[PDB]
Amino acid sequence: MIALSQFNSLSKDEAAGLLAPCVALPAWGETLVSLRPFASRHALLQTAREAMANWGEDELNAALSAHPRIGEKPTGSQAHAALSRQEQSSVDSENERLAQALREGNARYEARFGRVFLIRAKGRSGEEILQALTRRLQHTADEEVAEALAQLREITMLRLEGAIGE
Ligand SMILES: NC(=O)NC1=NC(=O)NC1=O
Numbered sequence: 001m002i003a004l005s006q007f008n009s010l011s012k013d014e015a016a017g018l019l020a021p022c023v024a025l026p027a028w029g030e031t032l033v034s035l036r037p038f039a040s041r042h043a044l045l046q047t048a049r050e051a052m053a054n055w056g057e058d059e060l061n062a063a064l065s066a067h068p069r070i071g072e073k074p075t076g077s078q079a080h081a082a083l084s085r086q087e088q089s090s091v092d093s094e095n096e097r098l099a100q101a102l103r104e105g106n107a108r109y110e111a112r113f114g115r116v117f118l119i120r121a122k123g124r125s126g127e128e129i130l131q132a133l134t135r136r137l138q139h140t141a142d143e144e145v146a147e148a149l150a151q152l153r154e155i156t157m158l159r160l161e162g163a164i165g166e
Helices: 004-009 012-022 026-034 041-051 057-066 079-087 096-113 126-136 141-163
Strands: none
Touching (some): 004 041, 012 026, 012 079, 012 141, 026 041, 041 141, 057 141
């Protein structure tokens, strides 16, 4: 976590590099970098929310390139992999029934919608995620695109909030 005044003074490449792990959508980060300096962390976060307001199915698809499946915890030490592992920390990997249910739930979701199941995993157990998956399997395509995008927005914001402090 770096301070706001520090973020405001970074070179364009260093600032974009800092924001890159939040979401695999270069336009989002580029917008934030281009609008520096920010008056406050409050203003930065608000601007960040505004910049994700017009995201659609195309953004969902592009962002999903950097998100592993729930239950498929990455091992890498780099920000992306470390963040995902940390976000899935409430998922019990030792529970064999859960692991199998997650694999089956994922396959079922992917067959239905054509994309990986996306959920803000931070603070959610494997059971909570499974129940969300069961609920979201009943959605129309548009309803599901909307929720998946809402979850993407949450993931991105939490990562941003963890990257830049007051
Ligand atoms: N497929 C996913 O939902 N993946 C993830 N959600 C998170 O919050 N972290 C992930 O890696």
